Design a protein around this ligand. Structure first.
Ligand SMILES: *[C@@H]1O[C@H](CO[C@H]2O[C@@H](C)[C@@H](O)[C@@H](O)[C@@H]2O)[C@@H](O)[C@H](O)[C@H]1NC(C)=O
Ligand SMILES: *[C@@H]1O[C@H](CO)[C@@H](O)[C@H](O)[C@H]1NC(C)=O
Lengths: 547, 1253
């Protein structure tokens, strides 16, 4: 290892390592866009476009579970088979099955295709980090690796920035009765497979891992790749049994305490971070919803005679109303409720309704012509001498006021806020170290979390999200470096893969628990996240030194 | 072998065996008269009968003329040798003509065989000839030889053409009615023949002209021979048994005596005038007489007065009377042989049978009186052949009985002046003056009620054993010949045979010239208003009888005002020929007119002019006559209403045998058989009553119609002739007109009208028989059946009870059908009866229909049709009745109490069309209200309604109830039973099941056999009772009730008939109408409506949906119908003034867009078979195909429109083609090659409740 380290040191840093860094940051971008499309696209896809206001389901999340298997199947296998071949196969299957998911009719097939795409991509991050760790100089190892991390975050940003441009309309998932148009989700799925496609184009030129190749044998090929790297830098400057036993050799053996501590830290961070990142948009939506619900107008004992309604009335409830000889023509019903109201010869024409619901109403001598007030909008209502003529086909919503654009804009800001906080960790990890950074960042993020109870506003919430995300990126970078630097080259891919699988497991746990505790309490998830961060940042000190 | 052998001439010698001087019995002393024997026991005396009757000693006409329609008096007749020889040849030829016929051969053989009985001995054990039943032929040597004979033919008495059969009576014995028999002297003359007029022959020879037919003398001689045959066996009815009539009223014959003997002799139609009870009485009386004479023959053992042995005489009388000895010299009668002999002598030997065998014309009934006296010549063969008679073969007289027509065969009959003046026996009628005398022989024949008697009321006890030319031919084979009583030597009697004729009852002279004062113009007044005197002055037609009777030179006429205006106009010669042709054209037009209204029951052909023709019912308007006819049936034709009353039929007393197994089954079988016999006997009695009292008036009205038509034709001819007579000679020769052709064509027109009049009158007579006479007997018969059924069922109460109970229940549950073919033999009437039976509606029991601004029961079973003041009738079609939920919006039907029997409603059917509006208020749920009720004392049947349900309920006294329901839902997109006409029919059979069919398809059925006593009711209540909804109402029409269960075929036929396929119908089932806006619905795609697109050439019309929804929660949910562009139908070529459209009408179609009308047109030159329809502004180009022919029949398939080109080429059926995405409307010829071509018109209705936004 000494001679290989010396020749790698003599090779230095130049054109080749930068080109490889770009073609690997492409794969990290793919991982980021996968996390986005699983945590903020599918959960908003299962929404009901018809309901101008809807909740949030997590059916698609299961793909996260698939990522788990990938991170252990395509993550541990590479250490026994190869790093370029495994990454090539993984990203190839991800791209191919994403493209197949683009041309899919029905939600079930699309979700299955997304699940297998997650299977393919979940084994990309360990392989890319292990790949790039066997190419850069030993002294200048913390910096460049740290730089790679930013690509990951950039991925989410890009995946967010384009999303609100293409699909700012929820409910596109649970709807197959629509025409061949409305395929904005189709083109979005097509274009989200761009970074992986460019990475697949690029990886044909990059060579295999020299250290791994030397480990297997054929030292002449290792010498050839070392000579090629040196020449490029000069010109610029002028078996599953074996893999399971290998995984066990990473846990219940000489590497026992280190892997346990690393798993604990990875679970804690991937719990708190992947919980809060989805909690914040949900909390901002709940704040807006509460502000809406405050301005609810209660109406009691009305007698509306001979009135023609032409405008839009929203957020009202009527009780014991007696609407006699009214007329609703070319108007919008928004979040308005009717109870115990007695209609009389009213006329409904070109009325478009959203979340309105009639209850216990006596409707007499009316005409419902050219409307979308279907049967399901009437609950325990008695018609009298009434009629139901032509009825607008399909429900209609004012999508202008029904765009969750914020949920993507908020995610964009959250992913952007880490860019200043990543550079101050890139050109610092060679000075403070690799264990003080992770603990300090974890504890500082915990302190920032304990300040969130104070804040209650849109500006306050977005500010706290930006602060937490900014101080919770150095932790991730130091974690990547400390988890790639410990294990030897014969176990690095496997251990990184199992840790990434545990990270995805924590992502599932957080993105379920935090997103479920909305509207019930605020101190419970915040206290839980602060406890997780404090525990992680207190345990991460008890790690072997690497410097 | 000829009858009379070796023709006798006249002047052959006095030989003594075949031609000799004879001395017939007489009161005093008579000079011997030359008489010639023509056969065994048959003599002819060619001399006037001035011997037998001492009163008839003169040949001059009496001062007081007889009550006779036609009679000729003469004094020089049969006084010359040539006359006597001609008389002899005529008599012999007529005898041979009768003998040739098989029936005539039997008659002559029976007359020759039947010698009078020898009962002249006071002592009971001897046989002696009657001294008055024999003649004395004096031999040329000088002495006489007394001989026994049977028949004598003598020339007539003073009355030349009065033929009668006289007999010589006895002091104590009635020889002609106690079976002994006596010689018969017939007063017959062949040179003279009565002449009649027949008006019921056109059915075979429409080319025949007037009537005036001459009676064949052979038939008259046969009638006299039949009389002699009856009197020779002593079975003639007593003369005092006479068919009595009524004479008090003004419309009745003053006097017409007709004995039962004449009725028996006439036979055929006439013989039915005597009921079966009197026939039974006569048969029993004559059977007892035959038994008495048989016993008298048995007792006697000695004979005095003749040489011949007694045993030969006993054999002769045995073969005459068909007695049955039993090898011990004990003569006795047997019921079978005497029944056969009596039937032969009474029914086989009749004038009608002789007419049928001879194939000649005769008056079918004695009412068709004789009119003229015709002198005829019989001896020459060129005028009367032996085999055919006047209808000589291979000549113009062979066909259509032209040999008996005096106006064709003029040379054979010479008309004579009869001595009974036309107005000698008359009745003087007038109103409160203008008094007219009407001949007695031109009045109605009204028999009294005494002549009809019944034994129906008397009961009957049942024990173990209680029981056509081919027929004539069978009798002919069975008859016995070759045995004719040989001539017997009789010891000569005294020179003068003392004897007086059979005493006749005195006939009182009926009063003459009775004056009647009335308050109305009778039919005789109208008939005598149309007559005229053929005077010199001009005769003008007029329409006012009050002036026609007053003014001799003006004749009443019942034709239109145009005709009387025309015939009164003075026309030059230049227009005379055209005038005559126009006149004959108007004659044909007026006489051949008929009545369209046919909803009547088998009175389909109603002749209107009959009303003003006779003042029928005392209205002088043809429209009024038709209205009264439809309102009152055939009663108005009858001058007097017959009174028919059937007594309560007797009960059947059943005897029970102790411990017997076969005899009881025999008693049950006998009971059922006697039930059938009782049904047949009551039917026969009713038929006899109807024939005697009803058909005669119809026949008289028919004859009077013929007379009135003849009078009108003669008046027109006289006017034409008088106008012709006025011209100058050059005008007559240049403009030639002849009378014979005009008379012939007018007669042919009269015959053409007479056919229709005959058909109408036959239909009226049969309708009256089956409407107002049969039910009064059917009620009695079925009440008797119900009474007998309980007795039979109690009687069954060994080991065979189930089969017997089933047999009796099934036998007595139904009824024996009435077939007229078993009681009358008139083809013309039987055909109309079969037509009556053919239609099912004619046999209905209740037939409520709206006719002539009156709701009436066309079946004539209902007494009172009471109508409430709040019952609506649809103005367009008044049959549809609308009933509301008010106490006063009801209809009541009260049936006649004497027609309704207790055991009705056991097997019966009901049918009606009902329209039920949609149920709106929630109160209607679970609410049953009766709409038709026939229950009294909580028992009967009722039709009720409920929310989407039609219920039929049958309930008995024991509170048991059986319901059959038809349920239709209201929550459907399109309903065929909501606010649409539905034809509900219900058939109940007490034995098996009660079923309900909707629209001619079986819907439900349930057993009703468990029910007990469903006691019948009398009132029917059309009223909504118990309905809690306040605005509820129904439409009901075409109600009908039937007295028998209806099978599926009859139900489907009723549905087809009552549907009225000739008229297109809208969605609800009403009548489609002109100038009314209907919404369009397509049956192929009922979920989309028709809409327009840019009216003009470049636009079109398509179909877009969905229609929508009209809902009321928990009540109904139906797709809206008042959608789309409304179609209206503007007339184009319909000549009918009403706005009702009919099949194959040609119409224009307008579509309304923005309350503006656009014609529905297209251009047919565009490529492809499809021709897309368009809407164009009414001032469009007429070159575009727009005329639409509407059709509703292919079997009926909804309402279809067929676009036609302006040149008559068929563009094709309207419909829709999916021309690209938009489903346009097209006139396609593919639809002409038989869906999508069937449409429904939905008009705005107040029963649907949808608001047309
Ligand atoms: C439904 O309403 C029923 C009647 O309430 C009527 O009161 C009138 C004043 C007017 O407000 C109408 O519109 C109302 O419908 C009441 O009897 C029922 O209990 C109500 N049912 C329930 C469960 O709310
Ligand atoms: C309000 O009603 C008036 C009266 O019909 C109409 O002119 C106006 O356009 C309506 N308002 C709107 C926004 O359409």
């Amino acid at each position: 290892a000494h001679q290989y380290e010396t020749i790698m040191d003599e090779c230095g840093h130049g054109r080749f390592q930068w080109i490889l860094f770009f073609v690997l940051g492409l794969a990290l971008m793919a991982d980021g866009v996968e996390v986005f499309v699983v945590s903020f696209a599918l959960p908003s896809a299962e929404k009901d476009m018809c309901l101008s206001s809807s909740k949030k389901g997590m059916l698609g999340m299961i793909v996260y579970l698939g990522m788990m298997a990938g991170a252990f199947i395509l993550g541990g296998l590479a250490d026994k088979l190869g790093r370029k071949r495994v990454l090539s196969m993984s990203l190839a299957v991800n791209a191919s099955f994403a493209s197949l998911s683009s041309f899919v009719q029905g939600y079930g097939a699309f979700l299955f295709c997304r699940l297998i795409s997650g299977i393919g991509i979940g084994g990309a991050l360990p392989i890319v980090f292990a790949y790039f760790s066997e190419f850069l100089s030993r002294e200048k190892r913390g910096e460049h690796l740290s730089w790679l991390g930013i690509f990951w975050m950039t991925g989410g940003l890009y995946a967010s920035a384009m999303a609100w441009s293409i699909i700012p309309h929820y409910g596109w998932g649970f709807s197959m009765g629509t025409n061949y148009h409305f395929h904005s989700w189709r083109v979005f799925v097509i274009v989200c497979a761009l970074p992986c496609t460019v990475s697949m184009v690029a990886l044909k030129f990059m060579p295999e891992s020299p250290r791994f190749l030397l480990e297997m044998g054929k030292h002449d090929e290792a010498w050839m790749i070392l000579k090629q790297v040196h020449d490029t830098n000069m010109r610029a400057k002028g078996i599953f049994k074996q893999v399971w036993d290998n995984a066990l050799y990473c846990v219940m053996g000489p590497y026992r305490m280190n892997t346990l501590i690393l798993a604990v830290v990875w679970f804690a961070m991937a719990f708190s971070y992947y919980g809060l990142t989805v909690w914040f948009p949900d909390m901002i939506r709940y704040f807006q919803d509460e502000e809406y619900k405050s301005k609810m107008k209660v109406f009691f004992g009305e007698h509306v005679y001979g009135a023609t309604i032409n405008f839009t009335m929203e957020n009202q409830i009527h009780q014991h109303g007696k609407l006699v000889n009214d007329k609703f023509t070319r108007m919008y019903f928004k979040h308005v409720l009717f109870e115990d109201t007695f209609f009389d010869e009213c006329y409904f024409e070109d009325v478009t309704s959203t979340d309105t619901y009639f209850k216990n109403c006596t409707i007499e001598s009316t005409i419902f012509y050219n409307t979308d007030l279907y049967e399901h909008k009437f609950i325990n209502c008695r018609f009298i001498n009434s009629t139901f003529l032509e009825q607008k086909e399909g429900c209609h919503m004012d999508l202008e006021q029904d765009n969750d654009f914020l949920i993507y804009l908020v995610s964009f800001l959250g992913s952007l806020s880490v860019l200043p906080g990543n550079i101050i960790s890139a050109l610092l990890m060679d000075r403070i170290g690799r264990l003080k950074m992770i603990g300090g960042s974890m504890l500082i993020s915990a302190v920032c979390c304990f300040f969130l109870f104070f804040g209650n506003s849109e500006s306050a919430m977005i500010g706290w999200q930006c602060l937490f995300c900014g101080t919770s990126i150095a932790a991730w970078n130091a974690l990547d470096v400390i988890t790639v630097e410990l294990y030897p080259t014969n176990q690095r891919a496997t251990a990184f893969g199992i840790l990434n699988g545990l990270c995805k497991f924590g992502a599932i746990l957080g993105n379920t628990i935090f997103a479920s505790f909305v509207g019930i309490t605020k101190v419970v998830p915040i206290l839980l996240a602060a406890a997780s961060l404090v525990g992680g940042g207190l345990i991460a000190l008890r790690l072997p030194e690497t410097r | 072998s000829p009858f009379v052998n070796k023709q006798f001439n006249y002047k052959d010698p006095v030989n003594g065996v075949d031609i000799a001087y004879i001395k017939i019995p007489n009161a005093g002393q008579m000079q011997p008269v030359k008489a010639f024997k023509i056969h065994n026991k048959i003599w002819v005396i060619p001399e006037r009968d001035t011997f037998t009757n001492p009163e008839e000693g003169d040949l001059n006409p009496p001062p007081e003329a007889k009550q006779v329609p036609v009679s000729y008096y003469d004094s020089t007749y049969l006084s010359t040798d040539n006359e006597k020889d001609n008389y002899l040849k005529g008599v012999t030829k007529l005898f041979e003509r009768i003998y040739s016929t098989d029936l005539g051969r039997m008659l002559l053989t029976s007359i020759v065989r039947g010698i009078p009985f020898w009962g002249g001995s006071t002592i009971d054990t001897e046989l002696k000839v009657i001294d008055t039943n024999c003649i004395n032929v004096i031999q040329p040597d000088g002495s006489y030889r007394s001989e026994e004979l049977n028949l004598v033919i003598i020339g007539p008495s003073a009355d030349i053409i009065q033929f009668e059969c006289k007999s010589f009576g006895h002091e104590v014995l009635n020889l002609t009615r106690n079976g002994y028999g006596s010689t018969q002297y017939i007063r017959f003359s062949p040179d003279f023949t009565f002449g009649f007029e027949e008006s019921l022959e056109v059915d075979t020879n429409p080319l025949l002209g007037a009537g005036k037919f001459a009676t064949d003398p052979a038939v008259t001689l046969a009638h006299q021979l039949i009389h002699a045959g009856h009197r020779l066996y002593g079975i003639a009815i007593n003369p005092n048994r006479v068919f009595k009539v009524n004479t008090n009223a003004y419309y009745e014959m003053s006097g017409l005596e007709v004995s039962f003997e004449e009725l028996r002799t006439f036979g055929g139609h006439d013989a039915k005038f005597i009921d079966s009870l009197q026939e039974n009485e006569f048969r029993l009386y004559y059977y007892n007489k035959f038994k008495d004479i048989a016993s008298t023959l048995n007792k006697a053992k000695s004979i005095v007065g003749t040489t011949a042995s007694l045993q030969y005489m006993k054999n002769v009388f045995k073969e005459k009377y068909l007695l049955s000895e039993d090898t011990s010299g004990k003569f006795s009668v047997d019921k079978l042989k005497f029944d056969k002999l009596y039937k032969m002598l009474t029914e086989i030997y009749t004038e009608d049978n002789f007419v049928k065998f001879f194939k000649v014309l005769n008056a079918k009934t004695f009412l068709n009186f004789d009119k003229a006296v015709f002198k005829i010549n019989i001896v020459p063969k060129v005028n009367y052949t032996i085999y055919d008679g006047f209808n000589l073969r291979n000549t113009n007289l062979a066909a259509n009985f032209n040999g008996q027509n005096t106006e064709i065969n003029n040379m054979n009959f010479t008309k004579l002046k009869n001595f009974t003046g036309l107005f000698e026996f008359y009745k003087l009628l007038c109103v409160r003056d203008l008094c007219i005398k009407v001949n007695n022989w031109d009045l109605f024949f009204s028999p009294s009620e005494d002549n009809f008697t019944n034994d129906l009321n008397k009961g009957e006890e049942i024990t173990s054993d209680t029981n056509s030319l081919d027929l004539i031919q069978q009798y002919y084979l069975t008859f016995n010949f070759d045995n004719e009583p040989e001539n017997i030597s009789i010891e000569n009697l005294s020179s003068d045979i003392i004897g007086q004729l059979e005493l006749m009852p005195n006939i009182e002279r009926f009063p003459n010239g009775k004056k009647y004062e009335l308050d109305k113009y009778t039919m005789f007044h109208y008939l005598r208003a149309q007559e005229f005197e053929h005077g010199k002055s001009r005769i003008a037609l007029t329409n006012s009888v009050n002036e026609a009777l007053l003014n001799p030179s003006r004749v009443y006429t019942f034709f239109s005002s145009d005709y009387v205006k025309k015939v009164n106009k003075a026309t030059e010669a230049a227009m005379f020929l055209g005038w005559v042709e126009q006149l004959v054209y108007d004659f044909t037009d007026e006489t051949s007119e008929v009545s369209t209204t046919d909803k009547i029951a088998d009175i389909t052909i109603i002749i209107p002019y009959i009303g003003p023709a006779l003042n029928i019912g005392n209205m002088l308007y043809k429209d009024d006559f038709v209205g009264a006819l439809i309102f009152s049936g055939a009663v108005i034709l009858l001058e007097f209403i017959p009174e028919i009353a059937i007594p309560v039929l007797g009960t059947f007393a059943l005897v029970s045998y102790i411990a017997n197994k076969v005899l009881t089954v025999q008693t049950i079988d006998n009971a059922l058989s006697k039930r059938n016999e009782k049904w047949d006997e009551v039917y026969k009695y009713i038929v006899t009553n109807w024939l005697a009292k009803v058909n005669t008036q119809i026949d008289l009205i028919r004859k009077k119609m013929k007379e009135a038509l003849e009078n009108q034709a003669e008046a027109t001819k006289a006017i034409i002739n008088y106008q012709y007579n006025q011209y100058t000679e050059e005008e007559k020769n240049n403009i030639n007109f002849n009378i014979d052709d005009l008379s012939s064509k007018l007669n042919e027109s009269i015959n053409k009208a007479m056919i229709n009049i005959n058909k109408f009158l036959n239909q009226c007579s049969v309708s009256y028989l089956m409407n107002s006479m049969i039910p009064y007997g059917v009620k009695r018969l079925e009440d008797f059946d119900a009474s007998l059924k309980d007795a039979l069922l109690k009687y069954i109460y060994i080991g065979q009870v189930d089969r017997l109970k089933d047999k009796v229940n099934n036998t007595l549950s139904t009824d024996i059908p009435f077939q007229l073919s078993k009681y009358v033999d008139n083809q013309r009437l039987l055909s109309t009866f079969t037509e009556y039976i053919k239609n099912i509606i004619n046999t209905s029991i209740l037939n409520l229909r709206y006719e002539s601004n009156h709701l009436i029961d066309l079946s004539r079973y209902a007494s009172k049709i009471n109508i409430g003041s709040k019952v609506n009738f649809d103005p367009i079609d008044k049959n549809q009745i609308q009933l509301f939920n008010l106490e006063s919006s009801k209809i009541e039907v009260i049936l006649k109490n004497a027609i309704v029997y207790n055991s009705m409603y056991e097997n019966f059917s009901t049918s009606f069309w009902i329209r039920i509006p949609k149920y709106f208020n929630s109160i209607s749920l679970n609410n049953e209200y009766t709409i038709i009720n026939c229950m009294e004392n909580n028992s009967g049947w009722k039709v009720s309604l409920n929310y989407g349900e039609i219920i039929w309920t049958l309930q008995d006294t024991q509170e048991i109830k059986q319901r059959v329901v038809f349920k239709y839902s209201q929550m459907i997109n399109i309903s065929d039973y909501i606010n649409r006409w539905i034809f509900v029919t219900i058939t109940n059979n007490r034995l098996n099941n009660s079923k309900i069919y909707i629209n001619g398809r079986l819907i439900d059925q349930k057993p009703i056999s468990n029910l007990g006593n469903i006691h019948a009711s009398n009132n029917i209540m059309f009223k909504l009772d118990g309905c809690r909804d306040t605005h509820r109402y129904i439409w009901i029409k075409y109600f009908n009730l039937f007295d028998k269960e209806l099978n599926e075929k009859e139900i489907k036929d009723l549905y087809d008939n009552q549907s009225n396929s000739g008229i297109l119908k809208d969605f609800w089932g009403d009548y489609l109408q002109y100038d009314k806006p209907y919404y369009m619905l397509n049956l192929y795609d009922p979920n989309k409506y028709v809409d327009v697109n840019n009216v003009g050439i470049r636009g079109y019309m398509y179909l877009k949906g969905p229609r929508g929804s009209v809902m009321t929660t928990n009540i109904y949910l139906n797709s809206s119908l008042y959608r789309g562009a409304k179609f209206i139908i503007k007339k184009y070529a319909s000549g009918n003034k009403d706005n009702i459209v009919r099949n194959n009408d040609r119409v224009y179609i307008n579509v309304v867009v923005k309350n503006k009308e656009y014609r529905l047109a297209t251009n047919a030159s565009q490529a492809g078979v499809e021709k897309i329809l368009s809407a164009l502004e009414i001032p469009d180009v007429g070159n575009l195909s727009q005329v639409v022919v509407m059709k509703s029949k292919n079997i009926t398939n909804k309402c279809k429109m067929n676009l036609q080109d302006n040149n008559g080429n068929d563009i094709g059926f309207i419909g829709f083609h999916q021309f690209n995405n938009i489903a346009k409307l097209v006139a396609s010829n593919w639809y002409n090659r038989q869906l999508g071509c069937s449409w429904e018109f939905i008009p705005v209705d107040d029963g649907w409740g949808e608001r047309p936004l």
